[PDB]
């Protein structure tokens, strides 16, 4: 659906102080809806790993990362999430999508359904397209068969929003009402 998350590369740094005349510059990959969320997830991680605040803070860069050619790949979205009971569970969750930013979006849609975890209770680590022979689960590995050939059964062919109707004529493509 051209996914709802974007791959931001937020580069930042503490500040030129007089204690620290030249501070360390940090790189950070984040999947965010926009860059305002993406800068704040960066300063969340500068606080909980480096004791750096955003007040004493520089964002040197926050730019999107363009995707790739659209090719069906296998992605290991090594992902972690917080629940109140059994906090900070980390899973691996191999997926099957055309892009890297869409693979993380699928991870956010089934960390939400299988486990009921929301955006801010999820951290995403090391998204990489892996080959076919490294896929471990057979529910993703079944698509590497070179001769798949399934039928589209049990469909919901709806009309095209310009010719939809309410009462059609039972064996006929008419429209008695609408």
Contact residues toward RNA (CB under 7 A) are 40-41, 43-44, 47-49, 51-55, 82, 84, 87, 116, 118, 120-121
Minimum CB separation from RNA for residue 162, in Å?
A: 36
Question: Distance (Å, rounded) from C-alpha 49 to C-alpha 42?
Answer: 11
Question: Distance (Å, rounded) from C-alpha 38 to C-alpha 54?
Answer: 13
Q: How many degrees, rounded to 5, is the angle at CA 18 between CA 14 and CA 23?
A: 30
Sign of dihedral through CA atoms 45, 47, 50, 52?
Answer: positive
Is the CB of 90 or the CB of 169 nearer to RNA?
90
Q: What are the residues facing 129 on neighbouring strands?
A: 75
Is the CB of 49 or the CB of 158 nearer to RNA?
49
Minimum CB separation from RNA for residue 24, in Å?
A: 14
Question: Distance (Å, rounded) from C-alpha 162 to C-alpha 105?
Answer: 31
Minimum CB separation from RNA for residue 63, in Å?
A: 19
| DSSP result, 115-164 | S---GGGEEEEEEEEE-GGG---HHHHTT--TT------S------SSS-
Minimum CB separation from RNA for residue 113, in Å?
A: 13
Report yes or no: 22 and 16 within 8 Å, Cβ to Cβ: yes
Is the CB of 46 or the CB of 127 nearer to RNA?
46
Minimum CB separation from RNA for residue 87, in Å?
A: 7
Is the CB of 86 or the CB of 145 nearer to RNA?
86
Is the CB of 84 or the CB of 147 nearer to RNA?
84
């Amino acid at each position: 659906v051209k996914p709802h998350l974007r791959h931001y590369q937020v580069v930042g740094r503490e500040s030129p102080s007089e204690k620290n005349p030249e501070p360390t510059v940090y790189k950070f990959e984040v999947f965010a809806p926009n860059f305002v969320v993406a800068k704040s997830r960066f300063w969340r991680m500068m606080r909980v790993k480096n004791k750096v605040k955003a007040t004493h803070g520089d964002v040197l860069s926050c730019k999107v990362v363009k995707d790739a050619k659209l090719v069906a790949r296998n992605y290991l979205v090594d992902i972690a999430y917080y629940s109140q009971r059994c906090g900070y569970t980390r899973m691996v969750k191999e997926f099957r999508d055309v892009s890297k930013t869409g693979a993380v979006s699928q991870a956010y849609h089934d960390l939400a359904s299988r486990h009921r975890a929301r955006y801010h209770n999820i951290e995403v680590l090391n998204v990489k397209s892996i080959p076919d022979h490294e896929v471990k689960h057979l529910s993703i590995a079944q698509y590497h068969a070179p001769n798949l050939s399934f039928p589209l059964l049990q469909r919901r062919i709806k009309a095209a929003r310009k010719d939809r109707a309410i009462f059609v004529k039972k064996n006929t493509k008419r429209a008695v009402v609408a």
